[PDB]
Amino acid sequence: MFDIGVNLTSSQFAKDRDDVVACAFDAGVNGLLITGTNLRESQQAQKLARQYSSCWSTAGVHPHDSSQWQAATEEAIIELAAQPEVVAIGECGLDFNRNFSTPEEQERAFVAQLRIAADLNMPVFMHCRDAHERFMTLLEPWLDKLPGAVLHCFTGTREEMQACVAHGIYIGITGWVCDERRGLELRELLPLIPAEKLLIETDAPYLLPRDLTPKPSSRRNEPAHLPHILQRIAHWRGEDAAWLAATTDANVKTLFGIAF
Ligand SMILES: [Zn+2]
Numbered sequence: 001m002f003d004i005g006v007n008l009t010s011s012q013f014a015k016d017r018d019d020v021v022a023c024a025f026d027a028g029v030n031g032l033l034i035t036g037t038n039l040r041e042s043q044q045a046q047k048l049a050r051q052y053s054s055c056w057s058t059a060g061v062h063p064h065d066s067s068q069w070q071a072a073t074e075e076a077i078i079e080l081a082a083q084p085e086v087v088a089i090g091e092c093g094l095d096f097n098r099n100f101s102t103p104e105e106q107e108r109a110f111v112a113q114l115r116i117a118a119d120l121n122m123p124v125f126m127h128c129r130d131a132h133e134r135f136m137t138l139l140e141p142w143l144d145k146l147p148g149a150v151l152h153c154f155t156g157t158r159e160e161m162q163a164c165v166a167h168g169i170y171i172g173i174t175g176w177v178c179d180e181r182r183g184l185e186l187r188e189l190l191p192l193i194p195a196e197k198l199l200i201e202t203d204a205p206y207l208l209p210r211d212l213t214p215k216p217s218s219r220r221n222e223p224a225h226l227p228h229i230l231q232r233i234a235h236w237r238g239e240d241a242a243w244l245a246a247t248t249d250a251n252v253k254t255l256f257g258i259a260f
Helices: 017-026 039-051 063-068 071-081 103-120 132-145 158-166 184-192 223-237 241-256
Strands: 002-006 031-034 055-059 086-095 124-129 149-151 170-173 198-200
Touching: 002 198, 002 223, 002 241, 017 223, 031 039, 039 055, 039 071, 039 086, 055 071, 063 086, 063 103, 071 086, 071 103, 086 103, 086 132, 103 124, 103 132, 124 132, 132 158, 158 170, 158 184, 184 223, 198 223, 198 241, 223 241
Parallel strands: 002 031, 031 055, 055 086, 086 124, 124 149, 149 170, 170 198
Antiparallel strands: none
16 A cells, blocks of 8 residues: 655645554555656655655656756755665656646756656656647657656546556556546556556555545545545456555556555
């Protein structure tokens, strides 16, 4: 039961972070991957990972902040990646919907990170929004030199999903699928994702599962809700939850090279 997408540096967790973490482990979660989205967040993510047991982090620059990418940024990321806690380069990718940085700025930062990851032999943690065609064109030639790649918070079409899977890319699924309103579309394709390419996450504090029975709705999501998300996904795939938990943990071990 590993959460590959915890935004643990969020201010929403400022007052009770020690509690959020202890409750996650007590609920059966055995590992958290803390997302870094720019240099300062990545440094904070690594410090949090070193502070708590069973935590690792990513180091990179999100397309939104790619405008901040400079040569000095590159050095700082390489240095951060050498730390034991940092196991993946990213969040990186492309976002042609928001365009908070120009496409030109985005491509430069994304390619520079693919390059860092290939050099260091580390997997990449990616984001893609309304940029699938260009995204795959830039990513495709780097895959044979990377240990792996995951596209987290995947909400795309089955055609995009099949293309990603055909290239050996892991697919991250959140509680988004527990929303009768927006997630039915993704829910329908869950049976199509190869078991060996599926990773689960909460994207906490966001995306609180709507079908959450306890009913603490319209609130902060947290990793302690991962088991509920996994039960649901297993149900929609026809699988046993304990079996799915073991299979996804194996995928995490395979992709990131960690013991948890
Ligand atoms: Zn995610």
